[PDB]
Amino acid sequence: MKNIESLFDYSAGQFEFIDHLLTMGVGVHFAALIFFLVVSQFVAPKYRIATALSCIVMVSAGLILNSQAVMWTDAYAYVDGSYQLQDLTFSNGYRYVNWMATIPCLLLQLLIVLNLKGKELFSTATWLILAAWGMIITGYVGQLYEVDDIAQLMIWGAVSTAFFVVMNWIVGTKIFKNRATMLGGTDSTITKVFWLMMFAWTLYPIAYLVPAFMNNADGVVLRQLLFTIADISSKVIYGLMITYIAIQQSAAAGYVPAQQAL
């Protein structure tokens, strides 16, 4: 009742498009899961956790997308020519709770392929996860108000954006100060990963703001479309680049299965 999805009836085309976006997302993540599983054998032990983290992200995201898809079809019924709310079973808040788990995984795999270790790894991961959790929690509280109090959504979103900026500064600083340690020419690749991250993660706050500038049923569809683009880019495409970097550095370090795979 606190999310704008509950305010509207949906045309068959809007309802089925959203359903198909979510089910397509389930398929893409679980297909990618198999890919990350199979190629982990070609990654040196030093980096293999990075590919395992992608597996964890795929199943985490895939399970939440599957849950959203079933909640969506549980919540609405086709009555008198439109899909109408029947039960209070759909909200975006499950995405937020999940980010508490997947964002730390996405950040950790980056730090691993940057060749951080020991105390710097643990210390950097700690500040990044705290910043990320601060971002997610303040965003979560904000979107509880996307119907009733847009001013409060904006203020919680400003606080959340401050955490996002500081998090990105930490990430960027570590990348640019450590890319000279990277093997196999991946010092070039990692810079592209950072820009991909900036682009993809910025789509989420744009989706967060849809209630402020497109509070109608098409805005609900747009938000799910943006989430879908952002999820695939920030998790799947990002994971593929992380895995490429891990295998390339593994090969340059003399791991034979990596050398043969490439």
Ligand SMILES: CCCCCCCC/C=C\CCCCCCCC(=O)OC[C@H](O)CO
């Ligand atoms: C809520 C309103 C707040 C508005 C706030 C607007 C400020 C945005 C400016 C920068 C964002 C930081 C993004 C991080 C970009 C990477 C920075 C970096 O990596 O620094 C390079 C390093 O210094 C070399 O070694």
Ligand SMILES: *C/C=C(C)/C=C/C=C(C)/C=C/C1=C(C)CCCC1(C)C
């Ligand atoms: C796979 C999911 C990912 C990478 C989620 C990332 C989410 C964010 C970067 C969220 C950022 C937000 C803000 C910067 C302010 C508005 C509230 C958020 C939480 C949507």
Ligand SMILES: CCCCCCCC/C=C\CCCCCCCC(=O)O
């Ligand atoms: C309050 C929340 C704080 C959470 C801190 C999280 C701590 C994570 C620290 C580092 C995880 C590294 C584990 C995997 C080791 C990879 C190194 C390797 O195998 O080459």
Ligand SMILES: CCCCCCCC/C=C\CCCCCCCC(=O)O
């Ligand atoms: C229970 C798992 C959550 C772990 C939280 C630990 C990380 C703390 C990070 C920053 C906390 C930001 C506090 C914002 C809460 C205020 C919202 C409210 O209480 O209404």
Ligand SMILES: [Cl-]
């Ligand atoms: Cl997620």
